[PDB]
Design an enzyme around this catalytic site. Sequence first.
Site, mmCIF file in Angstrom:
data_model
loop_
_atom_site.group_PDB
_atom_site.id
_atom_site.type_symbol
_atom_site.label_atom_id
_atom_site.label_comp_id
_atom_site.label_asym_id
_atom_site.label_seq_id
_atom_site.Cartn_x
_atom_site.Cartn_y
_atom_site.Cartn_z
ATOM 1 N N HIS A 215 31.340 35.912 8.373
ATOM 2 C CA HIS A 215 32.607 35.524 7.749
ATOM 3 C C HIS A 215 32.523 35.333 6.213
ATOM 4 O O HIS A 215 33.544 35.041 5.588
ATOM 5 C CB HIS A 215 33.260 34.305 8.424
ATOM 6 C CG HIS A 215 32.556 32.987 8.238
ATOM 7 N ND1 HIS A 215 32.625 32.284 7.044
ATOM 8 C CD2 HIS A 215 31.905 32.228 9.149
ATOM 9 C CE1 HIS A 215 31.982 31.146 7.257
ATOM 10 N NE2 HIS A 215 31.513 31.076 8.501
ATOM 11 N N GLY B 279 30.988 24.627 2.637
ATOM 12 C CA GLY B 279 29.804 25.159 1.971
ATOM 13 C C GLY B 279 28.539 25.066 2.812
ATOM 14 O O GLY B 279 27.502 25.608 2.424
ATOM 15 N N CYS C 28 28.104 26.405 5.832
ATOM 16 C CA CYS C 28 27.956 27.579 6.684
ATOM 17 C C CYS C 28 26.685 28.329 6.330
ATOM 18 O O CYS C 28 26.372 28.468 5.147
ATOM 19 C CB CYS C 28 29.183 28.477 6.581
ATOM 20 S SG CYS C 28 30.720 27.688 7.114
HETATM 21 O O1 LIG Z 1 35.003 26.150 9.605
HETATM 22 C C1 LIG Z 1 34.548 26.650 8.578
HETATM 23 C C2 LIG Z 1 34.976 28.021 8.090
HETATM 24 C C3 LIG Z 1 35.603 28.897 9.150
HETATM 25 C C4 LIG Z 1 34.806 29.724 9.940
HETATM 26 C C5 LIG Z 1 35.360 30.316 11.052
HETATM 27 F F1 LIG Z 1 34.563 31.107 11.822
HETATM 28 C C6 LIG Z 1 36.668 30.146 11.422
HETATM 29 C C7 LIG Z 1 37.471 29.334 10.638
HETATM 30 C C8 LIG Z 1 36.918 28.719 9.539
HETATM 31 F F2 LIG Z 1 37.681 27.850 8.829
HETATM 32 N N1 LIG Z 1 33.650 26.038 7.779
HETATM 33 C C9 LIG Z 1 33.159 24.720 7.865
HETATM 34 C C10 LIG Z 1 32.004 24.351 8.557
HETATM 35 N N2 LIG Z 1 31.561 23.095 8.701
HETATM 36 C C11 LIG Z 1 32.265 22.127 8.129
HETATM 37 C C12 LIG Z 1 33.459 22.338 7.394
HETATM 38 C C13 LIG Z 1 34.232 21.282 6.852
HETATM 39 C C14 LIG Z 1 35.412 21.544 6.213
HETATM 40 C C15 LIG Z 1 35.868 22.852 6.069
HETATM 41 C C16 LIG Z 1 35.146 23.897 6.567
HETATM 42 C C17 LIG Z 1 33.923 23.677 7.255
#
Ligand SMILES: O=C(Cc1cc(F)ccc1F)Nc1cncc2ccccc12
Lengths: 305, 305
Positions: free
Chosen positions: A41, A143, A145
Amino acid sequence: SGFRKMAFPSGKVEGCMVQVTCGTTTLNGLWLDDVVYCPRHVICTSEDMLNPNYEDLLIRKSNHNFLVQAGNVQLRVIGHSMQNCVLKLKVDTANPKTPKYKFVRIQPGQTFSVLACYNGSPSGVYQCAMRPNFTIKGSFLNGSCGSVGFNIDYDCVSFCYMHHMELPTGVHAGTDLEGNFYGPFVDRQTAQAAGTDTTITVNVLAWLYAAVINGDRWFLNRFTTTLNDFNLVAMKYNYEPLTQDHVDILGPLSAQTGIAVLDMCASLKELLQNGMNGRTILGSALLEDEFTPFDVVRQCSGVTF
Amino acid sequence: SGFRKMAFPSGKVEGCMVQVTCGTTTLNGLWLDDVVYCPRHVICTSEDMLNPNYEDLLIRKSNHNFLVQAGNVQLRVIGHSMQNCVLKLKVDTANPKTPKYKFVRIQPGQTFSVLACYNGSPSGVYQCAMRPNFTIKGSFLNGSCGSVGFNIDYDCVSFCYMHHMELPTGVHAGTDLEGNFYGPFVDRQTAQAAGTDTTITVNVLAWLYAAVINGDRWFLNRFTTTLNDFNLVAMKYNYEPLTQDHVDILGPLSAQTGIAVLDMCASLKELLQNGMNGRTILGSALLEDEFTPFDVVRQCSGVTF
Ligand SMILES: O=C(Cc1cc(F)ccc1F)Nc1cncc2ccccc12
Ligand SMILES: O=C(Cc1cc(F)ccc1F)Nc1cncc2ccccc12
Ligand SMILES: [Cl-]
């Protein structure tokens, strides 16, 4: 004496963390030999995430689109390919800090250490378990990921998790290092939810054995149970079923403490029906399920890496 | 989202762990530049331990009595001196893995990461706090002496603890890296006991602010308290007095959440009075006191939920 939530020493993994940038998106990558592994992603914009065609987004990118930074050194990308939900960036330089490693896919209940990273720089290390619902209760911000989960067996780092996303309940979803998600999750901005979680029974029993090794016996009783009667009680309290394999795995801890596995199951049965009655076990008022039987033996014996 | 007991990445410290042997005694040492720091009790037998005269035991030693091993390489000792309860072994090779470091003496309530080691080999990393009674609730077995506690704020390792001994209650006592013990402890096998421990109030408040930042407000109430009335109540639950310095330190978390320090104090008072009533705060059924205000700002988001 003492019992802490202990992570593996993270040094062998710290030497693999790099920063990967594609367009406006920056995240972490794992540099092993001449390949950098990161969530696919990274090639997406916020509109692309709503319905990504990763093969179509990827074909539009050249090697020079991926900026890879290893400390204050830019690595040059000489090739790129996708394997499931992980992007593999071939670089010109093999990581001289590459440890002995394997990519392993773990099962729910198994624990691992997470080296949380931001901009290719490690910020912290914590221990966590793959929940039965395939999420991890991690601590991650935007950040993070590309941060990885691992275990160490002798001198070999076994990479088992790569962070990809946060679910609406604040729990985390990711893949093994071959890009296969743990759980029914997809790398896309759409409605996704963690299924109802259950307690890792074998891990609770292992932790009760650790409490006995550390001098806490208040919860022990004269009683035993059959494995089937214990499983009816485990089903009632949202506890994972305990199998004969779990009983076998608890054998060494049972021999060390002199408390039969089904003898400890009757202590657990009583704690589930009656609670702790104002008491704690290893400084906890909850039954802790994120220590496997192997974690308990490793900590109660001082195994080194 | 999420909140875990997070340790610093241990890699910078792993590259400093060595094994120090003096006769039959083997323990850990910290190799920084051309000096190896270790507990001075490495020169004692076990009988010596009741009333050792370290200066008298040390004068009988030569450099070649000290065997220092870094990995599979023996380092040569070219000098030795004692500074308080730490023995400093000058070696003929500067550690090429020496990070940017400093020796800091911490106060009770401060947290740090411990890299537990056996035979100069790291086994695990965990987070812990210097208790108000100057002990640490660590996880250490025989051979862990010389394991160190540290913080890594901005690429620099601040060594704050060296493990020396286990007290009768299973808690641990040690020194700063200048060999000065934390608390009224001595490196003797005489009758020694940890004083009655208390809860680190400022850390519990910081953790309640972390819970608000992570979206949990069930414990808040419409009340406030004076600082003195809070202290009279909190002392009755064995909580450390909260000082004006603590209130000042909580200022940034108060501004981020919009909950005044004395308003959070009133929640804490009510939590002490009522318990959690079957609820949890950040996955805990107990009030957690091993996260400082600084740890909360480091791990939590800058945007409240
Ligand atoms: O969730 C995602 C990005 C994403 C990946 C995905 F495969 C689908 C939708 C998405 F938004 N990243 C994050 C990981 N861990 C913590 C976070 C905390 C806050 C904001 C993002 C965070
Ligand atoms: O406490 C000592 C040695 C010692 C040092 C000293 F300064 C005074 C008296 C002493 F006994 N060693 C240990 C340290 N940590 C954990 C342990 C667990 C089990 C057995 C020994 C452990
Ligand atoms: Cl697709």
